[PDB]
Design an enzyme around this catalytic site. Sequence first.
Site, mmCIF file in Angstrom:
data_model
loop_
_atom_site.group_PDB
_atom_site.id
_atom_site.type_symbol
_atom_site.label_atom_id
_atom_site.label_comp_id
_atom_site.label_asym_id
_atom_site.label_seq_id
_atom_site.Cartn_x
_atom_site.Cartn_y
_atom_site.Cartn_z
ATOM 1 N N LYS A 142 -7.270 -3.217 9.177
ATOM 2 C CA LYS A 142 -6.654 -1.770 9.193
ATOM 3 C C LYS A 142 -6.680 -1.284 10.307
ATOM 4 C CE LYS A 142 -8.397 1.171 6.245
ATOM 5 N NZ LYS A 142 -8.498 2.326 5.375
ATOM 6 N N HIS A 174 11.938 -35.957 -0.965
ATOM 7 C CA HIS A 174 12.945 -35.060 -1.418
ATOM 8 C C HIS A 174 13.330 -34.332 -0.249
ATOM 9 C CE1 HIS A 174 10.294 -31.741 -2.314
ATOM 10 N NE2 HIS A 174 9.256 -32.713 -2.484
HETATM 11 N N1 LIG Z 1 -2.872 -6.775 -8.236
HETATM 12 C C1 LIG Z 1 -3.817 -6.179 -7.321
HETATM 13 N N2 LIG Z 1 -4.076 -5.021 -7.172
HETATM 14 C C2 LIG Z 1 -5.019 -4.523 -6.503
HETATM 15 C C3 LIG Z 1 -6.082 -5.419 -5.788
HETATM 16 N N3 LIG Z 1 -7.051 -4.906 -5.174
HETATM 17 C C4 LIG Z 1 -6.493 -3.694 -5.118
HETATM 18 N N4 LIG Z 1 -5.531 -3.191 -5.873
HETATM 19 C C5 LIG Z 1 -4.710 -2.057 -6.423
HETATM 20 C C6 LIG Z 1 -5.794 -0.967 -6.290
HETATM 21 C C7 LIG Z 1 -4.940 0.332 -5.697
HETATM 22 O O1 LIG Z 1 -3.936 0.837 -6.801
HETATM 23 C C8 LIG Z 1 -3.875 -0.734 -4.914
HETATM 24 C C9 LIG Z 1 -4.480 -0.540 -3.508
HETATM 25 O O2 LIG Z 1 -5.858 -0.766 -3.326
HETATM 26 P P1 LIG Z 1 -6.516 -1.431 -2.222
HETATM 27 O O3 LIG Z 1 -8.034 -2.163 -2.255
HETATM 28 O O4 LIG Z 1 -5.324 -2.436 -1.416
HETATM 29 O O5 LIG Z 1 -6.545 -0.529 -0.856
HETATM 30 P P2 LIG Z 1 -7.651 0.193 -0.136
HETATM 31 O O6 LIG Z 1 -7.120 1.642 0.298
HETATM 32 O O7 LIG Z 1 -8.810 0.324 -1.053
HETATM 33 O O8 LIG Z 1 -7.742 -0.663 1.139
HETATM 34 P P3 LIG Z 1 -7.495 -0.097 2.690
HETATM 35 O O9 LIG Z 1 -8.083 1.269 2.781
HETATM 36 O O10 LIG Z 1 -6.106 -0.359 2.867
HETATM 37 O O11 LIG Z 1 -8.284 -0.981 3.271
HETATM 38 O O12 LIG Z 1 -3.832 -1.733 -5.300
HETATM 39 C C10 LIG Z 1 -5.683 -7.011 -6.190
HETATM 40 O O13 LIG Z 1 -6.608 -7.570 -5.689
HETATM 41 N N5 LIG Z 1 -4.644 -7.053 -7.026
HETATM 42 MG MG LIG Z 2 -6.725 3.200 1.736
#
Ligand SMILES: Nc1nc2c(ncn2[C@H]2C[C@H](O)[C@@H](COP(=O)(O)OP(=O)(O)OP(=O)(O)O)O2)c(=O)[nH]1
Ligand SMILES: [Mg+2]
Lengths: 480, 480, 480, 480
Positions: free
Chosen positions: A404, A120
């Site tokens: 990061k 396709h």
């Molecule tokens: N839908 C979804 N949301 C997630 C997931 N992991 C974390 N989150 C949510 C929780 C938070 O409200 C937001 C960001 O959490 P993260 O783990 O991505 O950021 P964190 O500051 O812990 O990581 P970083 O400091 O950037 O390394 O997204 C995921 O796998 N799926």
């Molecule tokens: Mg963070």
Amino acid sequence: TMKVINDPIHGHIELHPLLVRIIDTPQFQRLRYIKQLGGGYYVFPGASHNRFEHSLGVGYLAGCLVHALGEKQPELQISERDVLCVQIAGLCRNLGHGPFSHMFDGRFIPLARPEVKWTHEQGSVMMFEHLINSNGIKPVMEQYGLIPEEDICFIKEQIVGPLELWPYKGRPENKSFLYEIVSNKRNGIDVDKWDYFARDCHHLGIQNNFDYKRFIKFARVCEVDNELRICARDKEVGNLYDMFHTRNSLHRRAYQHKVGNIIDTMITDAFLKADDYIEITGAGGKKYRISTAIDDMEAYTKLTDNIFLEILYSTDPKLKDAREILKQIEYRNLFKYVGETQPTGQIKIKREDYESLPKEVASAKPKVLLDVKLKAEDFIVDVINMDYGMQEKNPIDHVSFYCKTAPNRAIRITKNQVSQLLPEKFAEQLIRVYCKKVDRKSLYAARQYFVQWCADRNFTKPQDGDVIAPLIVPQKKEWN
Amino acid sequence: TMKVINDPIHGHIELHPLLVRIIDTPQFQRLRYIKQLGGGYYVFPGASHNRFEHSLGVGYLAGCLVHALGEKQPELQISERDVLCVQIAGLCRNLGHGPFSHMFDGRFIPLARPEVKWTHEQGSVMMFEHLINSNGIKPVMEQYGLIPEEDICFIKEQIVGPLELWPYKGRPENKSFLYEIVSNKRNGIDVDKWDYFARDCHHLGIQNNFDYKRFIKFARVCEVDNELRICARDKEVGNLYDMFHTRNSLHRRAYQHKVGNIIDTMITDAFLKADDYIEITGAGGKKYRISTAIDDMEAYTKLTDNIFLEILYSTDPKLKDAREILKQIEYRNLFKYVGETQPTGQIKIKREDYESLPKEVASAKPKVLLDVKLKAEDFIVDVINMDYGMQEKNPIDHVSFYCKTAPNRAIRITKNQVSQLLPEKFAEQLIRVYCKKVDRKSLYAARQYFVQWCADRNFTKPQDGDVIAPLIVPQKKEWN
Amino acid sequence: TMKVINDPIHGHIELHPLLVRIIDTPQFQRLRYIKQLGGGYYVFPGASHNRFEHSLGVGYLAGCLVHALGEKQPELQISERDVLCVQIAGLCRNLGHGPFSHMFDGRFIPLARPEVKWTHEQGSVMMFEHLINSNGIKPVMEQYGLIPEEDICFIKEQIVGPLELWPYKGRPENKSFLYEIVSNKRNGIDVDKWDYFARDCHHLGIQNNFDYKRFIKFARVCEVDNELRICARDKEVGNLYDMFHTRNSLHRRAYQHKVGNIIDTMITDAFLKADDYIEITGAGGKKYRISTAIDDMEAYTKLTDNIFLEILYSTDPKLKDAREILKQIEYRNLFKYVGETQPTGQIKIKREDYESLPKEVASAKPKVLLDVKLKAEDFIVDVINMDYGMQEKNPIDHVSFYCKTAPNRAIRITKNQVSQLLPEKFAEQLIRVYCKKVDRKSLYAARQYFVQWCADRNFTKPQDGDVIAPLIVPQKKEWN
Amino acid sequence: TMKVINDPIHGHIELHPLLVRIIDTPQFQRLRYIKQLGGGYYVFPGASHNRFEHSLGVGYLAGCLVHALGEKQPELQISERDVLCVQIAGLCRNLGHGPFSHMFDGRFIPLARPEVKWTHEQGSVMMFEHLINSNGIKPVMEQYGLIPEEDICFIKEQIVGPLELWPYKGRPENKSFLYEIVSNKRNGIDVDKWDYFARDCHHLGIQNNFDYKRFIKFARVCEVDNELRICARDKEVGNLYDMFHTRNSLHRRAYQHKVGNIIDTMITDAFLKADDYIEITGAGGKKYRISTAIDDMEAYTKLTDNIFLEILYSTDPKLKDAREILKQIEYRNLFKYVGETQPTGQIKIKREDYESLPKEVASAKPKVLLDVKLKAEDFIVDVINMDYGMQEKNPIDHVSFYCKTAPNRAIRITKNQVSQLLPEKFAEQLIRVYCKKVDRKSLYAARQYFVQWCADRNFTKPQDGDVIAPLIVPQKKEWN
Ligand SMILES: Nc1nc2c(ncn2[C@H]2C[C@H](O)[C@@H](COP(=O)(O)OP(=O)(O)OP(=O)(O)O)O2)c(=O)[nH]1
Ligand SMILES: [Mg+2]
Ligand SMILES: Nc1nc2c(ncn2[C@H]2C[C@H](O)[C@@H](COP(=O)(O)OP(=O)(O)OP(=O)(O)O)O2)c(=O)[nH]1
Ligand SMILES: Nc1nc2c(ncn2[C@H]2C[C@H](O)[C@@H](COP(=O)(O)OP(=O)(O)OP(=O)(O)O)O2)c(=O)[nH]1
Ligand SMILES: Nc1nc2c(ncn2[C@H]2C[C@H](O)[C@@H](COP(=O)(O)OP(=O)(O)OP(=O)(O)O)O2)c(=O)[nH]1
Ligand SMILES: [Mg+2]
Ligand SMILES: [Mg+2]
Ligand SMILES: [Mg+2]
């Protein structure tokens, strides 16, 4: 200038007038008349959606990703011309689809035209060219700042890969990441997949394990081997694996649904039976078969799911055999599913061998008393290859990550770094057996043939084998 | 007659008046004040839901499954008395939960009371007894046809297993399947899981690949080994594996979120600091610590997430250290995450060793120039065990299936029959390292300590290791 | 045994084998090939769903409601025979629909055959009879305990009302509430509406203000005027009004969408042009027009949305005019929308006057200089009647309620009891004007004609009138 | 750089570091401990969500709208400084909310402090100032290009209107549209409403009548009366009305739920009883009552839903009366709902009116035989004003529209132009009566008092009146 379309998956989608011009053509609008999931609609009444709505979604998401990268990294020097080109490729990647989608290039064309090699995507490139030339789009491209010679190449390259170092003439290595968005040749992670995961679940009534919106947020462009490539954040690696898991769920549950596949098989059968008798007018008034319509885009424009009804409503005696098969579908008088099995050890089944497999099942002599004796023609054997889109290969080995602490520096993450639980090999094969004769006596026989054959070939024991062939199963020590 | 409660996961839930009487008590209503996901709410603002709503959902689903089996199989002789008992167990299985849920029995109690062995299910049985006695429920049970002596036993057995051949005094072997519904000891597939998968995804913003409603439709009771057990349809085996995949996604993404866990750790730290000074009034006016409140249910009724705010708003100088930690949470000055790693080969980490691990990391000598030196006290090491709920064991080996051809005959399906891709072992360990000192200079040092330690211990290379410890990574050959 | 079908609106639907036998026929399967929303799909790409899936939904909901009443009120003496009959009516209520649904009976048949009075419900009854007789269903009905003579009557009566004191021969007055479920002649509150509200919003991307599941929970049967009728709980009165609001919102936003209606008009135009030339084979080899296919069910079985493609792909010179119109749709070269207006005061527009209206607009002499002069044939005027389904009448005046204090005593609730804000009349008319000539000069002229005409007729001022006809609007004092 | 927060309503939200700095403070984090729907959580178990998550949603949407206008209309000269200010106002609009949200300023403060005129918006401004000063935000604002003197004014003005011809010092008239986004004084259409419609339905299990994403797409800025204002597209007028309809659905169904309101009342009663005895520490160690905490922001920071539990677990004898009321809530021993009625004709009830009303109901003499006699203290009368947010006024009269033909020219659309069905008046009053004595005998008596009172005052007949007071209803001819 510019138009809004409401999409149940994406909400309100803005489309550039150039995009709308492309959309409003016979060649694109043809997509409205092709079911995304083919025969799956017969198993899942929710799956009534067509290629057209999916294509809009793909175009929209391609736009999202390219814009997001531009906002995050202005140094990339992404231009509106770039954005439109990526969106056009997104919209037009499904242009080449035939009636009932994958059935057409997956089953019908190989049986009808073994000599030819066709896909396709090959069709989408041809159709796209036909769309542009027939509807005077190039002037419109020019009007909005596209350079047709460079950009049309770029669009086709995104759809089908290099047309024949850096192998692309559409854009330089500096712009390599753009080639990742619509169809990802390197690893298969692309917007086409994201839209269909969301759209198919919505319509099927299934649920999705991958978040595409999140992926866009954490996407970055980094230099990898003197190429600029989209890179995923290291954290998101688990989510990438989930994406593939989700894909496999869908394929097992829906795309490769046992009954849905059989219906696709039956539709193909009808097409083969009707192929000589059906005539489709092409450019210059030349007449084409269903199988040869792919040669002329003008003919192909008129070839859609409609053919199914055309055959069904036909009074022509030549079409009677084809008509009967479709009628049997309506009455739900389908070929009967016997069993599913898997090859053992390192064994895989080659494409060439497919023809001989029905004979092989008939050849098995179960150690059982049988009222009736089945024949090779009576059986259908369907081989399905389930993988992470790279055949045996692991796609995540081909993904680039950043951390990061140093966003600019790309890194590689091995499977061992993510999990010890993850598989050594990422592809497996399923074998499904169906019987064309549906009587109770014939069905009982087929089960015996099938289970014996599994035993003979040292295939995995069918799950229901104890129940369907209680006499046959004890013979094999390995099954216990 | 029936009260209707509207639930965002399940829609409109009908509750029997006996059920409502149990619900409208201090002991049950206590569940309103305990967050389902504990510290996860600080990472996921959507996860504001409490144990109370989850419990209703569990009770409802338990009702669904038991009713479905009754309608499908009247021969089972399921009675309303049976239905109510199953529902009451569903509602009350979470009764025992402490503040911030799993943090309390997962982290705080083990550190505060190592001598004692305690679980929230133990608490739920104790709390249930307290609930019945304090609020005069037994007469109400009788009024609706329950026999309290037999039935209370039955309810407690469902929650916590046999209270110490058939081992249950609540119901005979013919009714064995009932014990499967609320808490499944044998394989962990139960309604409690289904509600929380749906509820947590809804509130978190995540999405799941297990359909519980479909599972109920295809559930059947069959004789297995002179026991009547709930059996899944053979087709559904893939979906069962998907259920466990979904569970692991959630655990990795949310329940075991690195920052969410650290907050739970900090909250626990504060609790330990406050434990001697806080007083909770129990039956007879006896006074209990946070740690000893589990000994008296009257005290435990008043112990909830509220304690966190009680400590935070406290003016007492004795509570100052605890107060400061909670304040640091509010300001978002948290212990810093350094890395994650995995053990390799045979190696597994025992509970006894956990205390040792921070000292081990400090002991590593990186071989890089360091501005500052860290101490064992500075580090936090968190060991997480990820599995299919059966430790090493595959739960599906402990599931019973039936086939369309013979619905009454139970069968067993091995892993090979489902897929070659599925893991050989179903459990793994994750090690997360955090640094209590948050300054830039300390954080750099901690990374060096950590990566060296991984190398020394022959653990898996951290994903970001190249970036965080470029000097350390080259030393280990295996990492190249 | 029962077949399970997965529906994105309803989840997993169980179907009785007798139901499945009916479904698996050419007559029912025909519904797969008819779009629920007709030309709306061209405006809303999500609305790809067909009548078939909607019919399953209607059948399922009918089952839900009847079962719920049986469980709540065993004294009603509802039987499985009753349940199957109600479900069959639900499934087969849409059997009569023509290509593009309401377009066919709404627009095409009235223009093509003014002499005949026809509706899809009339068609559904005829098609149902044809379905039963062609496929030998009566024996199957007998096998599952139905009495064909009595029950077929009952089914037809539900679909189309009395076939000509109690006027129904299908069931006695004690069973009157059964006639309320599938098609409610008295109130228009029925399961057919509930499924399409949910299904259309899901596919369109709009959202729904009526909870049908809640309504079923609170539904009761009470004696009203020596009749047993379905009664709503008094609380739910606001929700009933919301249901109608939701219906109106859908109709203004989607069913009566201005562009969608114009497409339907164009499609009808093409059908009229093709009508003489198209031939559809009927029983005995008799040949029928698109317009006369309704006379023979064998012919009608083959009449579906497919006709649109048949015309589009036709090479016949006789069909050229019809073909062109469809081609213009593909290119998006549509008749142009000029304006919407409303009649004022007493005035309403009679059906006979519709022919006159385009001439009336051409007759208006706006006070502006016009280069081009339009003609009556150039204009299209579409009159749409919007109401609560009872024309001027308030449906809730024809609803019966019960109270928590006396669930068996039916009561009546007036509009004043619910709200002072609710409308004095529940019906209004919209007039939409389109111009067949699409050039910019013609469009400017058409606006002047239109606004002047509004002023002449004392119709409400168009919303954009100040902008489209700045010279015309100052003349009318009432507008300024 | 940007933090990402996952929101179940909005998905992944990007937050500017400046925004994150503000969020990570005691003053903002306080919002985590206040239920959005107050006592509604006791009626709707899904509604566990707090002000904090809503605030993030409001901030995010404010960002969406302001960015969208910037992209569509660069001439507007919107700056990042502008974007951040608008977002900060969005985040901080709810800062002032007290325990249980509207209960606190809606019920408790007016009863506790009739002399003071207070609203949560006043509180939000005070709290915002306190947040900035305590946590040294101004330097951070400066660092990211804000001018604190101008911008803090701008933020406060958005929250609470002019602080005291253009009345705002925060921005000039050219920037007038910015004041529309977070809190729309003139018409009430703002992002705060959009987030809560979506968020509340999602938690509740209800569904939305308004599409906010669509509104943003069609929003434009046009000059109106020497002001630049946000203008809606003419087409969208129906949707705007739907937004207000949706708001009223929610208010009737949930915000003003009869039981939920009674719980709020009971909680308020407990607060009043506890007010003298509770002490909250403020700046300098000063001590405040619940009622006087609004005077000191430091005290107010610690005042949250926690107070409810503090009272409930209190052992103090002074708090015993307050404690009992909360205990009655737990047992579900609530004040009993008697009926709802509406005033007729021109009659309206003034706020001063409220105190007299319980006495008025007791005064009514039904003259039906009564076992017991009720007293004014026994009754509770709750008066609820339902409107389109403008009291009597139609908000759409205060909206500006533009047309496709001339996007830059603003226009006005009258109610007659949208629909004849729409109400002449947009506000109405509901009167709910509850009885403090819960016994069956007392309840019967209260109904008679109530229905007689409705008859005496010529109020609308209660819906269940015939059933609850059969003897009383015949007396009034207007009802019969
Ligand atoms: N839908 C979804 N949301 C997630 C997931 N992991 C974390 N989150 C949510 C929780 C938070 O409200 C937001 C960001 O959490 P993260 O783990 O991505 O950021 P964190 O500051 O812990 O990581 P970083 O400091 O950037 O390394 O997204 C995921 O796998 N799926
Ligand atoms: Mg963070
Ligand atoms: N969700 C929702 N979608 C709508 C509504 N009205 C129309 N749509 C859908 C249909 C289309 O796919 C998309 C754009 O439709 P419009 O009615 O806004 O465009 P149209 O070209 O008819 O108006 P225009 O050309 O701007 O005057 O939105 C609505 O009220 N709600
Ligand atoms: N949601 C969901 N739907 C499914 C799944 N598999 C199939 N379906 C849909 C397709 C059909 O509408 C309906 C029944 O499909 P099944 O494969 O369960 O029935 P089938 O006749 O193929 O198998 P059987 O005759 O029971 O052996 O459910 C699944 O994993 N999830
Ligand atoms: N193609 C098309 N469909 C329409 C039009 N008006 C309404 N519909 C759709 C909306 C619903 O999806 C469906 C309902 O048709 P049915 O015959 O099942 O019910 P009925 O005709 O009683 O419609 P109602 O009950 O008034 O909603 O028809 C129209 O003008 N054109
Ligand atoms: Mg109630
Ligand atoms: Mg089947
Ligand atoms: Mg507001």
